Coordinates of N, CA and C in Angstrom, one line a residue:
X1 N 178.0 -14.7 108.4 CA 177.7 -14.1 109.8 C 176.6 -15.0 110.5
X2 N 175.9 -14.3 111.4 CA 174.9 -15.0 112.2 C 174.0 -14.1 113.0
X3 N 172.7 -14.1 112.7 CA 171.8 -13.2 113.5 C 171.4 -13.8 114.8
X4 N 171.6 -13.0 115.8 CA 171.2 -13.3 117.3 C 169.7 -13.5 117.4
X5 N 169.3 -14.0 118.6 CA 167.9 -14.1 118.9 C 167.6 -13.5 120.3
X6 N 166.4 -13.0 120.3 CA 165.8 -12.4 121.6 C 165.9 -13.5 122.6
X7 N 165.9 -14.8 122.2 CA 165.9 -15.9 123.0 C 167.1 -15.9 124.0
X8 N 168.3 -16.4 123.6 CA 169.4 -16.4 124.5 C 170.5 -15.3 124.4
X9 N 171.4 -15.3 125.2 CA 172.5 -14.3 125.3 C 173.8 -15.0 124.6
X10 N 173.5 -16.1 123.8 CA 174.6 -16.8 123.2 C 175.3 -16.1 122.1
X11 N 176.6 -16.2 122.0 CA 177.4 -15.5 121.0 C 178.3 -16.6 120.2
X12 N 178.5 -16.4 119.0 CA 179.3 -17.3 118.1 C 180.7 -17.1 118.4
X13 N 181.6 -18.0 118.2 CA 183.1 -17.9 118.4 C 183.6 -16.7 117.6
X14 N 184.2 -15.8 118.3 CA 184.9 -14.6 117.6 C 185.7 -14.9 116.4
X15 N 186.4 -16.0 116.4 CA 187.3 -16.5 115.4 C 186.6 -16.6 114.1
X16 N 185.2 -16.8 114.0 CA 184.6 -16.9 112.8 C 184.1 -15.5 112.2
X17 N 184.7 -14.4 112.7 CA 184.3 -13.0 112.3 C 184.9 -12.8 110.9
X18 N 184.4 -11.8 110.3 CA 184.8 -11.4 108.9 C 186.1 -10.8 109.0
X19 N 186.8 -10.8 107.8 CA 188.1 -10.2 107.7 C 187.9 -8.8 107.2
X20 N 186.9 -8.6 106.5 CA 186.6 -7.2 105.9 C 185.1 -7.1 105.6
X21 N 184.4 -6.2 106.3 CA 184.9 -5.3 107.5 C 185.5 -6.2 108.6
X22 N 186.7 -5.8 109.1 CA 187.4 -6.6 110.1 C 186.7 -6.7 111.4
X23 N 186.3 -8.0 111.7 CA 185.6 -8.2 113.0 C 184.1 -8.4 112.9
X24 N 183.4 -8.1 111.9 CA 182.0 -8.2 111.9 C 181.7 -9.7 112.2
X25 N 180.9 -9.9 113.3 CA 180.5 -11.3 113.7 C 179.1 -11.7 113.8
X26 N 178.2 -10.7 114.2 CA 176.8 -10.9 114.3 C 175.9 -9.7 114.2
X27 N 174.7 -9.8 114.0 CA 173.8 -8.7 114.0 C 172.5 -9.1 114.8
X28 N 171.7 -8.0 115.1 CA 170.5 -8.3 115.9 C 170.7 -8.4 117.4
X29 N 169.7 -9.0 118.0 CA 169.8 -9.2 119.5 C 169.1 -8.0 120.1
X30 N 169.8 -7.4 121.2 CA 169.4 -6.3 121.9 C 170.7 -5.7 122.6
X31 N 170.3 -4.8 123.5 CA 171.5 -4.1 124.3 C 171.2 -4.3 125.8
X32 N 170.5 -5.4 126.1 CA 170.2 -5.7 127.6 C 171.5 -5.9 128.3
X33 N 171.5 -5.6 129.6 CA 172.6 -5.7 130.5 C 173.2 -7.1 130.3
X34 N 172.5 -8.2 130.4 CA 173.0 -9.5 130.3 C 173.7 -9.8 128.9
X35 N 173.0 -9.4 127.9 CA 173.7 -9.6 126.5 C 174.9 -8.8 126.4
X36 N 175.0 -7.6 126.9 CA 176.1 -6.7 126.8 C 177.3 -7.3 127.7
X37 N 177.1 -7.7 128.9 CA 178.0 -8.3 129.7 C 178.7 -9.4 129.1
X38 N 177.9 -10.3 128.4 CA 178.3 -11.5 127.8 C 179.2 -11.1 126.6
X39 N 178.9 -10.0 125.9 CA 179.6 -9.6 124.7 C 181.0 -9.3 125.1
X40 N 181.2 -8.5 126.2 CA 182.5 -8.3 126.7 C 183.3 -9.5 127.2
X41 N 182.6 -10.3 128.1 CA 183.2 -11.5 128.5 C 183.9 -12.3 127.5
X42 N 183.3 -12.3 126.2 CA 183.8 -13.1 125.2 C 184.5 -12.3 124.1
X43 N 185.0 -11.1 124.4 CA 185.8 -10.3 123.5 C 185.0 -9.7 122.3
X44 N 183.7 -9.3 122.5 CA 182.9 -8.8 121.4 C 182.3 -7.4 121.9
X45 N 182.0 -6.5 121.0 CA 181.4 -5.3 121.4 C 180.5 -4.8 120.3
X46 N 179.4 -4.0 120.6 CA 178.6 -3.5 119.6 C 179.0 -2.2 119.0
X47 N 178.6 -2.0 117.8 CA 179.0 -0.8 117.0 C 178.2 -0.7 115.7
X48 N 177.5 0.3 115.6 CA 176.6 0.4 114.3 C 176.1 1.9 114.3
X49 N 175.9 2.4 113.1 CA 175.5 3.8 112.9 C 173.9 3.7 113.2
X50 N 173.3 4.9 113.6 CA 171.9 4.9 113.8 C 171.2 4.5 112.5
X51 N 170.2 3.8 112.6 CA 169.4 3.4 111.4 C 169.7 1.8 111.1
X52 N 170.9 1.4 111.3 CA 171.2 0.0 111.0 C 170.9 -0.9 112.2
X53 N 170.9 -2.2 112.0 CA 170.5 -3.1 113.1 C 171.8 -3.2 113.9
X54 N 171.7 -3.8 115.2 CA 172.9 -3.9 116.0 C 173.9 -4.8 115.3
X55 N 175.1 -4.4 115.4 CA 176.3 -5.1 114.8 C 177.3 -5.4 115.9
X56 N 177.8 -6.6 116.0 CA 178.8 -7.0 117.0 C 180.1 -7.3 116.4
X57 N 181.2 -6.9 117.1 CA 182.5 -7.1 116.5 C 183.6 -7.7 117.5
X58 N 184.6 -8.2 116.9 CA 185.8 -8.8 117.5 C 186.9 -8.9 116.4
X59 N 187.4 -7.7 116.2 CA 188.5 -7.5 115.2 C 189.8 -8.3 115.4
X60 N 190.6 -8.4 114.4 CA 191.8 -9.1 114.4 C 192.8 -8.4 113.4
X61 N 193.9 -7.7 114.0 CA 194.2 -7.6 115.4 C 193.2 -6.7 116.2
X62 N 193.5 -6.6 117.5 CA 192.8 -5.8 118.5 C 193.7 -4.7 118.9
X63 N 193.1 -3.4 119.0 CA 193.9 -2.4 119.5 C 193.9 -2.4 121.1
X64 N 195.1 -2.3 121.6 CA 195.1 -2.4 123.1 C 196.1 -1.4 123.6
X65 N 196.1 -1.2 124.9 CA 197.1 -0.3 125.5 C 197.7 -0.8 126.9
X66 N 199.0 -1.1 126.9 CA 199.5 -1.5 128.1 C 199.7 -0.2 129.0
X67 N 199.0 -0.1 130.1 CA 199.0 1.1 130.9 C 200.4 1.7 131.2
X68 N 201.3 0.8 131.4 CA 202.7 1.3 131.6 C 203.3 1.9 130.5
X69 N 202.9 1.5 129.2 CA 203.5 2.1 128.0 C 202.8 3.4 127.5
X70 N 202.0 3.9 128.3 CA 201.3 5.2 127.9 C 202.4 6.2 127.6
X71 N 202.4 6.7 126.4 CA 203.5 7.7 126.1 C 203.0 9.1 126.4
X72 N 203.9 9.9 127.1 CA 203.5 11.2 127.6 C 204.7 12.1 127.2
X73 N 204.4 13.0 126.1 CA 205.4 14.0 125.7 C 205.9 14.8 126.9
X74 N 207.0 15.5 126.6 CA 207.7 16.4 127.6 C 206.8 17.6 127.8
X75 N 206.1 18.1 126.7 CA 205.3 19.2 126.8 C 204.0 18.9 127.7
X76 N 203.6 17.7 127.6 CA 202.4 17.3 128.5 C 202.8 17.1 130.0
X77 N 203.9 16.6 130.2 CA 204.4 16.5 131.6 C 204.5 17.8 132.2
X78 N 204.9 18.8 131.5 CA 205.1 20.2 131.9 C 203.7 20.7 132.2
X79 N 202.7 20.4 131.3 CA 201.3 20.8 131.6 C 200.6 20.1 132.7
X80 N 200.8 18.8 132.9 CA 200.3 18.1 133.9 C 200.8 18.4 135.3
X81 N 202.0 18.9 135.4 CA 202.6 19.3 136.6 C 202.0 20.6 137.1
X82 N 201.5 21.4 136.2 CA 200.8 22.7 136.5 C 199.4 22.6 136.0
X83 N 198.9 21.4 135.9 CA 197.5 21.2 135.4 C 196.4 22.1 136.0
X84 N 195.5 22.6 135.0 CA 194.3 23.3 135.4 C 193.1 22.5 135.5
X85 N 193.3 21.2 135.4 CA 192.2 20.2 135.5 C 192.1 19.5 136.7
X86 N 191.0 18.9 137.0 CA 190.7 18.0 138.1 C 190.2 16.8 137.5
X87 N 190.5 15.6 138.0 CA 190.0 14.4 137.5 C 189.2 13.6 138.6
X88 N 188.1 13.0 138.1 CA 187.3 12.2 139.0 C 186.9 10.9 138.3
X89 N 186.2 10.0 139.2 CA 185.9 8.7 138.7 C 184.4 8.6 139.0
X90 N 183.6 8.2 138.2 CA 182.2 8.0 138.3 C 181.4 9.1 138.9
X91 N 181.6 10.3 138.5 CA 181.0 11.5 139.1 C 179.8 11.9 138.1
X92 N 180.1 11.7 136.8 CA 179.1 12.1 135.8 C 179.1 11.2 134.7
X93 N 178.8 9.9 134.8 CA 178.8 8.9 133.7 C 178.0 9.4 132.6
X94 N 176.8 9.8 132.8 CA 175.9 10.3 131.8 C 176.5 11.5 130.9
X95 N 177.1 12.4 131.5 CA 177.7 13.6 130.8 C 178.8 13.1 129.9
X96 N 179.6 12.2 130.6 CA 180.7 11.7 129.7 C 180.4 11.1 128.4
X97 N 179.5 10.1 128.5 CA 179.0 9.4 127.3 C 178.4 10.3 126.4
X98 N 177.6 11.3 126.9 CA 177.0 12.3 126.1 C 178.0 13.2 125.4
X99 N 179.1 13.5 126.1 CA 180.2 14.3 125.7 C 180.9 13.5 124.5
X100 N 180.9 12.1 124.6 CA 181.6 11.3 123.6 C 180.6 11.2 122.5
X101 N 179.3 11.2 122.8 CA 178.3 11.1 121.7 C 178.1 12.3 120.9
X102 N 178.3 13.5 121.5 CA 178.1 14.7 120.8 C 179.4 15.2 120.0
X103 N 180.4 14.3 120.0 CA 181.7 14.7 119.3 C 181.5 14.4 117.9
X104 N 182.1 15.2 117.0 CA 182.1 15.0 115.5 C 180.8 15.6 114.9
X105 N 180.4 16.8 115.3 CA 179.2 17.4 115.0 C 178.0 17.0 115.5
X106 N 177.9 10.7 116.0 CA 178.5 9.4 116.3 C 177.4 8.3 116.6
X107 N 177.8 7.1 116.5 CA 176.9 6.0 116.6 C 176.2 5.9 117.9
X108 N 176.7 6.7 119.0 CA 176.1 6.6 120.3 C 174.7 7.2 120.2
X109 N 173.7 6.3 120.1 CA 172.3 6.7 119.9 C 171.8 6.7 121.4
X110 N 170.6 7.3 121.6 CA 169.9 7.3 122.9 C 169.8 5.8 123.4
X111 N 169.5 5.0 122.6 CA 169.4 3.5 123.0 C 170.7 3.1 123.6
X112 N 171.9 3.3 122.8 CA 173.1 3.0 123.3 C 173.4 3.6 124.7
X113 N 173.1 4.9 124.7 CA 173.4 5.6 125.9 C 172.6 5.0 127.1
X114 N 171.4 4.6 126.9 CA 170.6 4.0 128.0 C 171.2 2.7 128.4
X115 N 171.5 1.9 127.4 CA 172.1 0.6 127.6 C 173.4 0.6 128.4
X116 N 174.4 1.6 128.1 CA 175.5 1.6 128.9 C 175.3 2.3 130.2
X117 N 174.2 3.1 130.2 CA 173.8 3.8 131.5 C 173.4 2.7 132.5
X118 N 172.7 1.7 132.0 CA 172.3 0.6 132.9 C 173.4 -0.2 133.4
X119 N 174.5 -0.4 132.5 CA 175.7 -1.1 133.0 C 176.3 -0.2 134.0
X120 N 176.3 1.1 133.9 CA 176.9 1.9 134.9 C 176.2 1.8 136.2
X121 N 174.8 1.9 136.1 CA 173.9 1.7 137.2 C 174.2 0.5 138.0
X122 N 174.4 -0.5 137.2 CA 174.6 -1.9 137.7 C 176.1 -2.1 138.3
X123 N 176.9 -1.2 138.1 CA 178.3 -1.3 138.5 C 179.3 -1.9 137.7
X124 N 179.0 -2.0 136.3 CA 180.0 -2.5 135.4 C 180.6 -1.6 134.4
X125 N 180.0 -0.5 134.1 CA 180.5 0.6 133.2 C 180.9 1.8 134.1
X126 N 182.1 2.3 133.9 CA 182.6 3.4 134.7 C 183.0 4.6 133.8
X127 N 183.2 5.7 134.5 CA 183.7 6.9 133.7 C 184.8 7.7 134.5
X128 N 185.6 8.4 133.7 CA 186.7 9.2 134.3 C 186.3 10.6 133.8
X129 N 186.3 11.6 134.6 CA 185.9 12.9 134.2 C 187.1 13.9 134.4
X130 N 187.2 14.9 133.4 CA 188.2 15.9 133.4 C 187.4 17.3 133.5
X131 N 187.6 18.0 134.7 CA 187.0 19.2 134.9 C 187.9 20.4 134.9
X132 N 187.4 21.5 134.3 CA 188.1 22.7 134.3 C 187.2 23.5 135.2
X133 N 187.6 23.3 136.5 CA 186.8 24.1 137.6 C 185.4 23.4 137.6
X134 N 184.4 24.2 137.2 CA 183.0 23.7 137.2 C 182.5 23.0 136.0
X135 N 183.4 23.2 134.9 CA 183.0 22.6 133.7 C 183.7 21.2 133.3
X136 N 182.8 20.3 132.8 CA 183.3 19.0 132.4 C 183.8 19.2 131.0
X137 N 185.2 19.1 131.0 CA 185.9 19.4 129.6 C 186.5 18.2 128.9
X138 N 186.1 17.0 129.4 CA 186.6 15.8 128.8 C 186.4 14.6 129.6
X139 N 186.9 13.4 129.1 CA 186.7 12.2 129.9 C 186.6 10.9 129.1
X140 N 186.4 9.8 129.7 CA 186.3 8.5 129.1 C 185.4 7.6 129.9
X141 N 184.8 6.7 129.2 CA 184.0 5.7 129.9 C 184.3 4.4 129.3
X142 N 183.9 3.3 130.1 CA 184.2 1.9 129.6 C 183.5 0.8 130.5
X143 N 183.9 -0.4 130.1 CA 183.3 -1.5 130.9 C 184.5 -2.2 131.6
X144 N 184.4 -2.4 132.9 CA 185.4 -3.1 133.7 C 185.3 -4.6 133.6
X145 N 186.4 -5.2 133.2 CA 186.4 -6.7 133.0 C 187.6 -7.2 133.9
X146 N 187.5 -7.1 135.3 CA 188.5 -7.6 136.1 C 189.7 -6.6 136.2
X147 N 190.9 -7.1 135.7 CA 192.0 -6.3 135.7 C 192.2 -5.7 134.4
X148 N 191.3 -6.0 133.5 CA 191.2 -5.5 132.1 C 190.1 -4.4 132.0
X149 N 190.4 -3.3 131.4 CA 189.5 -2.3 131.2 C 189.2 -2.1 129.8
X150 N 187.9 -2.2 129.5 CA 187.5 -2.0 128.0 C 187.0 -0.6 127.8
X151 N 187.9 0.2 127.3 CA 187.6 1.5 126.9 C 186.7 1.7 125.7
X152 N 185.5 2.3 125.9 CA 184.6 2.5 124.8 C 185.0 3.8 123.9
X153 N 185.2 4.9 124.7 CA 185.5 6.1 124.0 C 185.9 7.2 125.0
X154 N 186.4 8.3 124.4 CA 186.8 9.4 125.3 C 186.6 10.7 124.4
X155 N 186.6 11.9 125.1 CA 186.3 13.1 124.4 C 187.1 14.3 125.0
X156 N 187.4 15.3 124.3 CA 188.1 16.5 124.8 C 187.6 17.8 124.2
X157 N 187.2 18.7 125.1 CA 186.6 20.0 124.8 C 187.7 21.0 125.1
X158 N 188.8 20.6 125.6 CA 189.9 21.6 125.9 C 191.3 20.8 125.8
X159 N 192.3 21.6 125.3 CA 193.6 21.0 125.1 C 194.1 20.1 126.2
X160 N 194.6 18.9 125.8 CA 195.0 17.8 126.8 C 194.0 17.3 127.8
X161 N 192.7 17.6 127.5 CA 191.7 17.1 128.6 C 191.7 15.5 128.6
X162 N 191.6 14.8 127.4 CA 191.5 13.4 127.3 C 192.9 12.8 127.7
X163 N 194.0 13.5 127.3 CA 195.3 13.0 127.6 C 195.3 12.8 129.1
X164 N 194.9 13.9 129.8 CA 195.0 14.0 131.2 C 194.1 12.9 131.9
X165 N 193.0 12.6 131.3 CA 192.1 11.5 131.8 C 192.7 10.2 131.8
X166 N 193.4 9.9 130.6 CA 194.0 8.7 130.4 C 195.3 8.5 131.3
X167 N 196.1 9.6 131.4 CA 197.2 9.7 132.2 C 196.9 9.3 133.6
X168 N 196.0 10.1 134.1 CA 195.6 9.9 135.5 C 195.0 8.5 135.8
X169 N 194.2 8.0 135.0 CA 193.6 6.8 135.0 C 194.6 5.6 135.0
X170 N 195.6 5.7 134.1 CA 196.7 4.6 134.0 C 197.4 4.6 135.3
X171 N 197.7 5.7 135.9 CA 198.4 5.7 137.2 C 197.7 5.1 138.3
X172 N 196.4 5.5 138.4 CA 195.5 4.9 139.4 C 195.2 3.5 139.1
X173 N 195.1 3.0 137.8 CA 194.8 1.7 137.4 C 196.0 0.8 137.8
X174 N 197.2 1.2 137.3 CA 198.3 0.4 137.6 C 198.6 0.3 139.1
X175 N 198.6 1.3 139.8 CA 198.7 1.3 141.2 C 197.9 0.4 142.0
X176 N 196.7 -0.1 141.5 CA 195.9 -1.0 142.2 C 195.7 -2.4 141.5
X177 N 196.6 -2.7 140.5 CA 196.4 -4.0 139.8 C 196.0 -4.0 138.4
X178 N 195.6 -2.8 137.8 CA 195.2 -2.7 136.6 C 196.2 -3.3 135.5
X179 N 195.8 -4.2 134.6 CA 196.7 -4.8 133.7 C 196.7 -4.5 132.3
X180 N 195.5 -4.2 131.7 CA 195.4 -4.0 130.3 C 194.2 -3.1 130.0
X181 N 194.3 -2.2 129.0 CA 193.2 -1.4 128.6 C 192.9 -1.8 127.2
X182 N 191.7 -2.1 126.8 CA 191.3 -2.4 125.5 C 190.8 -1.2 124.7
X183 N 191.4 -1.0 123.5 CA 191.1 0.2 122.8 C 190.3 -0.2 121.5
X184 N 189.9 -1.4 121.4 CA 189.0 -2.0 120.3 C 189.8 -1.7 118.9
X185 N 189.6 -0.6 118.4 CA 190.4 -0.3 117.1 C 191.4 0.8 117.3
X186 N 192.5 0.8 116.5 CA 193.5 1.7 116.6 C 193.3 3.0 115.8
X187 N 193.5 4.2 116.5 CA 193.3 5.4 115.7 C 194.6 6.3 116.0
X188 N 194.6 7.4 115.2 CA 195.8 8.3 115.3 C 196.2 8.8 116.6
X189 N 195.2 9.3 117.3 CA 195.4 9.8 118.7 C 195.8 8.7 119.6
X190 N 195.0 7.6 119.6 CA 195.3 6.4 120.4 C 196.7 5.9 120.1
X191 N 197.1 5.9 119.0 CA 198.4 5.3 118.6 C 199.5 6.2 119.2
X192 N 199.3 7.5 119.0 CA 200.3 8.4 119.5 C 200.5 8.3 121.0
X193 N 199.5 7.8 121.7 CA 199.5 7.6 123.1 C 200.2 6.4 123.6
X194 N 200.6 5.6 122.5 CA 201.3 4.3 122.8 C 200.4 3.0 122.7
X195 N 199.2 3.1 122.2 CA 198.4 2.0 122.0 C 198.9 1.2 120.9
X196 N 198.8 -0.1 121.0 CA 199.3 -1.0 119.9 C 198.3 -2.1 119.5
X197 N 198.7 -2.9 118.4 CA 197.9 -4.0 118.0 C 198.4 -5.3 118.4
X198 N 197.6 -6.2 118.8 CA 198.0 -7.6 119.1 C 197.0 -8.5 118.5
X199 N 197.4 -9.8 118.2 CA 196.5 -10.8 117.6 C 195.2 -10.9 118.4
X200 N 194.1 -11.2 117.8 CA 192.8 -11.4 118.4 C 192.9 -12.6 119.4
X201 N 193.5 -13.6 119.2 CA 193.6 -14.7 120.1 C 194.5 -14.4 121.2
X202 N 195.5 -13.5 121.1 CA 196.3 -12.9 122.2 C 195.4 -12.2 123.2
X203 N 194.6 -11.3 122.6 CA 193.7 -10.6 123.4 C 192.6 -11.4 124.1
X204 N 192.0 -12.4 123.4 CA 191.0 -13.2 124.0 C 191.7 -14.0 125.1
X205 N 192.9 -14.4 124.9 CA 193.7 -15.1 125.9 C 193.8 -14.3 127.2
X206 N 194.3 -13.1 127.0 CA 194.4 -12.0 128.1 C 193.1 -11.8 128.7
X207 N 192.1 -11.7 128.0 CA 190.7 -11.4 128.5 C 190.3 -12.4 129.5
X208 N 190.5 -13.7 129.1 CA 190.0 -14.9 129.9 C 190.8 -15.0 131.2
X209 N 192.0 -14.6 131.2 CA 192.9 -14.6 132.3 C 192.5 -13.4 133.2
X210 N 192.4 -12.1 132.7 CA 192.1 -11.0 133.5 C 190.7 -10.8 134.1
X211 N 189.7 -11.4 133.4 CA 188.4 -11.4 133.8 C 188.3 -11.8 135.3
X212 N 189.2 -12.8 135.6 CA 189.3 -13.4 136.8 C 189.8 -12.4 137.9
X213 N 190.9 -11.6 137.5 CA 191.5 -10.7 138.3 C 190.5 -9.8 139.0
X214 N 190.9 -9.1 140.2 CA 190.1 -8.2 141.0 C 190.9 -7.1 141.4
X215 N 190.3 -5.9 141.4 CA 191.0 -4.7 141.9 C 190.4 -4.5 143.3
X216 N 190.9 -3.5 144.0 CA 190.4 -3.4 145.4 C 188.9 -3.2 145.4
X217 N 188.2 -3.7 146.5 CA 186.7 -3.5 146.7 C 186.2 -2.2 146.4
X218 N 186.9 -1.1 146.7 CA 186.4 0.3 146.5 C 187.0 1.0 145.3
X219 N 187.8 0.3 144.5 CA 188.4 0.9 143.3 C 187.5 1.8 142.5
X220 N 186.3 1.4 142.2 CA 185.4 2.1 141.5 C 184.4 3.0 142.0
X221 N 184.4 3.3 143.3 CA 183.4 4.2 143.9 C 183.7 5.7 143.5
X222 N 182.7 6.5 143.4 CA 182.9 7.9 143.0 C 183.9 8.6 143.9
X223 N 184.9 9.1 143.3 CA 186.0 9.8 144.0 C 186.9 10.7 143.2
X224 N 187.6 11.6 143.8 CA 188.4 12.4 143.1 C 189.7 11.7 143.0
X225 N 190.3 11.7 141.8 CA 191.6 10.9 141.5 C 192.8 11.9 141.5
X226 N 192.5 13.1 140.9 CA 193.6 14.0 140.8 C 193.0 15.5 141.0
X227 N 193.6 16.2 142.0 CA 193.2 17.5 142.3 C 194.4 18.2 142.9
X228 N 195.3 18.9 142.0 CA 196.5 19.6 142.4 C 196.3 20.6 143.5

């Protein structure tokens, strides 16, 4: 491996990551906006349980999701056509990440929250919210990397809340140039939604191409995406 330094925002080539644990590449450093941005630019992300030092990753393969391949069951389509939810973009970044943090009775520590909150404040991290009237019932947040979106996590406090968030986002994302969504690691729910695994070099390749891409100037301003 390799320990980072408070000095620079330099990162070692992802290809020198460990095989097991898959993707472990470096430790230390900090969660400053600059260091974080660089992490994503180069296909790396932080992940570590509270108590441990900062750990950075770039797994092989990488879980990803082609927006157009999002699988939506027939029961969900029925649900979404008569949806009881409203979806918004960047209305409550803080609550969404907190919602993702309080899930599972998670590594999302206060420090991590502030760090991504800074990125949101600076205009790089964004959130999708799912509301059951006045209540935030689900959502997802991530870091925008051009036409590629790096999804950190999502949460659901009501049936189909997160499915709705993803469904609505993919429609809005594709409609304006969105090309790929990064899922980091593949999990059961994510896989059922059509997420798949591709080689790390394929992902980095895509990343380098898409970072350059641009969505419309206002794509990320706080707004209502879906309100039946």
